[PDB]
């Protein structure tokens, strides 16, 4: 039921996102590679419609948890890989405290040797001069724990966590994330015991790139379950 064999080695990744936030329409493409044995991602994203209308860090969680490293004793809890190659739908609602929300739907699946994440994002209720549309977020990311449980009603998982976005005046903008994942295929999947992913992300710029872009490295390992339990 585990699909670890698809994830051997380095796997190319493609990402495509169409988004509309307070009627500002935009698109983002990304390409890179993942190594689930190490739990590491490297990707570069470009805004193909001009300047991104929201800050890049707000799109990090939207823009492939199947590349998480699952420990030796936790292979029976890896839902994300178990749903491949047909893949899973990942839906979120993200509430930015004192501001608007994003709602997202994505399909993550293999197209051949490439892992692809295809996303629609709709943003509503943002303040024109808030931290988001105001572009008051620093260009950086912090470490978070992403809590995963099995869905008690359907074949799938329920996931929640709270992202801290640091603001240029020293304050912090919180983004509460609520997430569900369901398989696309009707094959068996792994429905995990409660656990979490320890997430770290670092953002940078390619000094030669003139398009609006984001270079992103991530390291993710699952944790939280006692051997054999
Ligand atoms: Na199998
Ligand atoms: Na605007
Ligand atoms: Zn172990
Ligand atoms: Zn158990």
List keywords for this structure.
1 helix, binds zinc ion, 2% helix, binds sodium ion, 229 residues, Green Fluorescent Protein
Describe the fold and architecture.
The PDB classes it as fluorescent protein. Keywords: beta barrel, fluorescent protein, chromophore cyclisation, single amino acid deletion mutation, Cyclisation. This protein is mainly beta and 229 residues long. It has one domain: Beta Barrel (Green Fluorescent Protein). Helices cover 2% and strands 49% of the residues. It is built from one helix and eleven strands. It has one helix at residues 79-82; strands at 11-21, 24-35, 40-47, 88-96, 101-111, 114-124, 144-150, 157-166, 172-183, 195-204, 213-223. It has an eleven-stranded mixed beta barrel. The longest helix has 4 residues, at 79-82. It is globular. The two termini are 18 Å apart. The relative contact order is 0.22. It binds sodium ion (NA) (2 copies) and zinc ion (2 copies). The site of one zinc ion has 4 residues, from loops. Residues 71-73, 227 line the site of one zinc ion.
